[PDB]
Design an enzyme around this catalytic site. Structure first.
Site, PDB file in Angstrom:
ATOM      1  N   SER A  82       0.800  -1.221   0.000  1.00  6.11           N
ATOM      2  CA  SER A  82       0.000   0.000   0.000  1.00  6.11           C
ATOM      3  C   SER A  82       0.835   1.273   0.000  1.00  6.11           C
ATOM      4  O   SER A  82       0.260   2.353  -0.140  1.00  6.11           O
ATOM      5  CB  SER A  82      -0.953   0.024   1.198  1.00  6.11           C
TER       6      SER A  82
HETATM    7  C1  63U Z   1      -1.679  -2.319   1.581  1.00  9.34           C
HETATM    8  O1  63U Z   1      -0.552  -2.707   1.752  1.00  9.34           O
HETATM    9  C2  63U Z   1      -2.865  -3.224   1.955  1.00  9.34           C
HETATM   10  N1  63U Z   1      -2.546  -4.636   1.805  1.00  9.34           N
HETATM   11  C3  63U Z   1      -3.466  -5.558   1.523  1.00  9.34           C
HETATM   12  O2  63U Z   1      -4.593  -5.268   1.143  1.00  9.34           O
HETATM   13  C4  63U Z   1      -3.084  -7.013   1.793  1.00  9.34           C
HETATM   14  N2  63U Z   1      -3.725  -7.943   0.819  1.00  9.34           N
HETATM   15  C5  63U Z   1      -3.505  -7.288   3.225  1.00  9.34           C
HETATM   16  C6  63U Z   1      -2.581  -7.704   4.171  1.00  9.34           C
HETATM   17  C7  63U Z   1      -2.969  -7.936   5.482  1.00  9.34           C
HETATM   18  C8  63U Z   1      -4.282  -7.756   5.863  1.00  9.34           C
HETATM   19  C9  63U Z   1      -5.209  -7.339   4.937  1.00  9.34           C
HETATM   20  C10 63U Z   1      -4.822  -7.103   3.625  1.00  9.34           C
HETATM   21  C11 63U Z   1      -3.254  -2.988   3.385  1.00  9.34           C
HETATM   22  N3  63U Z   1      -2.760  -1.729   3.929  1.00  9.34           N
HETATM   23  C12 63U Z   1      -2.541  -1.849   5.279  1.00  9.34           C
HETATM   24  C13 63U Z   1      -1.561  -0.854   5.895  1.00  9.34           C
HETATM   25  O3  63U Z   1      -1.722   0.318   5.588  1.00  9.34           O
HETATM   26  O4  63U Z   1      -0.652  -1.322   6.567  1.00  9.34           O
HETATM   27  C14 63U Z   1      -3.144  -2.837   5.987  1.00  9.34           C
HETATM   28  C15 63U Z   1      -2.837  -3.109   7.430  1.00  9.34           C
HETATM   29  C16 63U Z   1      -4.223  -3.753   5.474  1.00  9.34           C
HETATM   30  S1  63U Z   1      -4.967  -3.239   3.910  1.00  9.34           S
END
Ligand code: 63U
Ligand code: 63U
Lengths: 504, 504
Positions: free
Chosen positions: B229
């Site tokens: 992200s």
């Molecule tokens: C961005 O990095 C984004 N990542 C994801 O959507 C993955 N697939 C994911 C990983 C763990 C849990 C849920 C989804 C996520 N961005 C963030 C962040 O800003 O750190 C989180 C915690 C989950 S959505």
């Protein structure tokens, strides 16, 4: 994932390096993995799992148990002994039906012959994060952009694995007997310049990584040596063509006084007035100093330059050393005549020596036969015979060759230990002093020599040139001085001549 | 024999690498050396010599005695334990006045800070025959022809050793706590692109060679990541400039069905119809897919291309990876919007991120300040700030920066663990899935994430950018998911902001 890295082949199509699949052992140890499942997905019995795992991996059950008992961890691995496991090892472990135990495929770079022409082929290193392989030395490095990918291109060498074995075995013998600080041997087709075999000691094992990095320098292309008396042949060739060498003309042997220093024949006194041909057979240092005086200092520099010295041969190895012709003062010039002060690469020596067997034409040595892609059939590169230069005439070559015949086969020869039964041999010997890396002087000791032989067989019309040198024996340094590299040259030369169907 | 290899310096002139003199122990054991002299010039008492010598070298006297008792040998050395001895070690041994025992000086390459920016500085290897040093990685390798000689040129980096310590110390913390498979941290001057500190784990120790070769890839320039992200900021920058992102306009959260796959926001259900600013604060995946739909697939590809991704930044590290923009189909395009499928280098991310703090001008990151020779005073090269490209307007940069501020400091933020007392902090978080090196899927597990933070402070007008990522914690993998790299970013950022005299 990663594209398959191309293969390194020998001249007959045998694989020297390739990508294979091995396996890494992984053990889930956290109870949370089995919460949802009917059959347990983690290691329940650490003692039995460790006891049973020690039947495949080189680990004692107390150690596996120790690693199996780490906290705040979901999975564990088992270090160096957990990976590079064979497909057979995989099946052994899977039959065990141990809960939480799995094997994960991993690409490894496989060198089927182990420690085999190692300082030529090189080694590819792996980035665990992506599996990407990157050559760190030799051909793997030089040709990394082609070898890498979709599938990388292949690199085919001129090496003959059958002749390479003779070399590898001979060098092991040298180390055992002499424990030298440095050692190399190379076999070159005398009519094409192809490198049929090369190796050095100490070296490393591409397959295990053992000793990789301990000596970065490839002796053939990157290290430099004061060659010693093997260098005398090019002074002799120059003298012949300039009309200064007459084999029967007498000359005053003994010594010459150069800038207040005594440069003596190896017996201090000389042999009086002796024919010029005999002095070369004796490896008379005063002969060469005298011939230099005849030809002229200025002319002798151009002569050595036109034999390729002081400049790179422009081969396809990285960082090829150019050497240098020591010509700053009379002492340097006079000592260069018998191969001190001036420094050379072994590849330069092979190039110059080849003039005597190709009507005076120097052959550029070469070891890369083909870079080509096996899927597309695109050929990016093809090696070939190439004349590096013609410094002498055909007549001068033959006259050089006659004195090389006598060096080994005169009744007064001091090189009969290089003779081989059934095969007529010729060449030039060298016993050279080697500079101290720190100290600004020559290494001292009872016999602190770089001993070498620049040989070819059958004489006059050879099929191969063999150059072998051994620097600073630490065991049996007396025999090293008396026998030079003869215990390497004979088994290499003889076995090659047999494999190549040359008649006894 | 060898010229002194030039030095590697930090931005304030501290030595990171230089040539020093070390010592190798030599023991003559043949009685003939002491034959002519009154007091013995060889080792007469082997037992006492061996017992006493083991008080300095890491060898048991039973082994020393064996080596001192080899036959057909004049002198002996003692392998790896006999060399790289200090002047202190030397004086101790000489105080013993052991007969036949001597110390021989040797040049070694000295890295005064040991394990310190090791994957950037690199390591130079020694060829024992000649003492010639040759860089095998990093700056030592890239600039080997300049560092080599007559005296080699110096290489001055932009690294500040003071900030490097902060990085080195924080990365040790992460390893102890999380035991990740991969980890890196980097500090960049936010207004010049200078690299003030960089390090990675695992790494090696330039001074001892420990673990050298285990991982060739420099994480900053040579390794590749699905960033996660943190990539969303560039999608946001595009949408802002295209007029598709309005901070207050609502959008449908929840999920989107892409080529038969359901891609959901991280809480599965979404938050209903919420404003676009809040979605970015939450790291809503559907927001980025919705924004992509608005801008258009083709236009979005040019956007990521104009932020520098998919091409090398043309830095001065060797073999710089290009990444690739994952765009083969809708699924790849849509996952690329939140930083999957597409792969990048950390140096690309740093280059793109700098746009938000230079009126939209991307800065080329750089770490070589000068190559120059201290004897002649010739300067061969001087580093400088360089605009990589201006992909957005000043107004778009300001608007991106406002959402990065809210990511950390909104009352609804999910990133408050990245706050630091006394300092206004901002940035973007990442929790990304990691592709299996061998296989066709993502690494599976409880929290198999590459967690990262792309932060800067003071907010709006930062002095430095800090980028840190941690791949696949093997210990404490739950906390790794909850805290990301915060336990590294906070001490790095806080100690640097203080060292840089930024007011609390
Ligand atoms: C961005 O990095 C984004 N990542 C994801 O959507 C993955 N697939 C994911 C990983 C763990 C849990 C849920 C989804 C996520 N961005 C963030 C962040 O800003 O750190 C989180 C915690 C989950 S959505
Ligand atoms: C040529 O290599 C020449 N070498 C020397 O003159 C050195 N300085 C030397 C070494 C040992 C003993 C005397 C001199 C010698 N050529 C050869 C040979 O052909 O091998 C020998 C043995 C001595 S003269």
């Amino acid at each position: 994932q990663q594209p398959e890295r191309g293969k390194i082949y020998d001249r007959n199509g045998k694989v020297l390096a390739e990508d294979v699949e091995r396996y890494k052992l992984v053990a889930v140890i956290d109870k949370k993995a089995s919460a949802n499942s009917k059959k347990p997905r983690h290691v329940v019995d650490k003692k039995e799992t460790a006891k049973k795992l020690s039947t495949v991996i080189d680990m004692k059950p107390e150690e596996i148990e120790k690693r199996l008992s780490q906290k705040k961890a979901f999975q564990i691995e088992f270090g160096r002994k957990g990976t590079n496991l064979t497909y057979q090892d995989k099946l052994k472990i899977e039959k065990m039906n141990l809960p939480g135990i799995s094997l994960l495929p991993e690409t490894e770079r496989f060198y089927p012959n182990g420690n085999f022409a190692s300082h030529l082929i090189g080694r590819a290193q792996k980035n665990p994060d992506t599996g990407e392989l990157k050559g760190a030395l030799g051909v793997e490095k030089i040709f990394d952009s082609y070898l890498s990918g979709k599938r990388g291109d292949d690199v085919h060498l001129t090496i003959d694995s059958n002749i390479q074995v003779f070399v590898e075995e001979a060098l092991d013998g040298m180390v055992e007997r002499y424990q030298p600080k440095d050692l190399f041997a190379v076999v070159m087709d005398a009519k094409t310049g192809e490198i049929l075999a090369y190796s050095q000691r100490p070296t490393f094992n591409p397959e295990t990584g053992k000793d990789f990095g301990k000596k970065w320098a490839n002796d053939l292309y990157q290290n430099t040596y004061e060659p010693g008396s093997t260098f005398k042949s090019y002074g002799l060739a120059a003298a012949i063509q300039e009309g200064a060498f007459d084999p029967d003309k007498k000359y005053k042997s003994g010594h010459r006084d150069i800038m207040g220093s005594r440069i003596s024949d190896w017996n201090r006194v000389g042999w009086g007035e002796i024919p010029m041909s005999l002095g070369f057979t004796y490896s008379s240092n005063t002969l060469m100093m005298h011939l230099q005086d005849l030809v002229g200092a200025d002319k002798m520099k151009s002569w050595y330059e036109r034999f390729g010295f002081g400049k790179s041969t422009k081969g396809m190895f990285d960082g090829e050393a150019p050497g240098q012709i020591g010509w700053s003062n009379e002492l340097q010039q006079k000592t260069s005549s018998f191969g001190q002060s001036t420094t050379v690469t072994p590849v330069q020596m092979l190039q110059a020596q080849s003039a005597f067997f190709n009507d005076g034409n120097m052959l550029k040595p070469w070891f890369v036969n083909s870079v080509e892609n096996p899927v597309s059939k695109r050929q990016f590169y093809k090696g070939q015979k190439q004349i590096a230069g013609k410094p002498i005439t055909k007549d001068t070559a033959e006259k050089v060759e006659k004195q090389l015949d006598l060096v080994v086969n005169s009744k007064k020869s001091h090189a009969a230990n290089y003779r081989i039964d059934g095969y007529e041999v010729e060449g030039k010997t060298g016993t050279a002093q080697v500079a101290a890396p720190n100290g600004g002087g020559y290494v001292k000791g009872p016999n602190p020599y770089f001993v070498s032989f620049m040989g070819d067989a059958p004489k006059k019309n050879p099929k191969v040139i063999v150059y072998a040198g051994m620097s600073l024996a630490q065991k049996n340094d007396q025999e090293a001085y008396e026998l030079g590299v003869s215990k390497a040259f004979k088994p290499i030369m003889e076995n090659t001549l047999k494999y190549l169907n040359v008649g006894k």
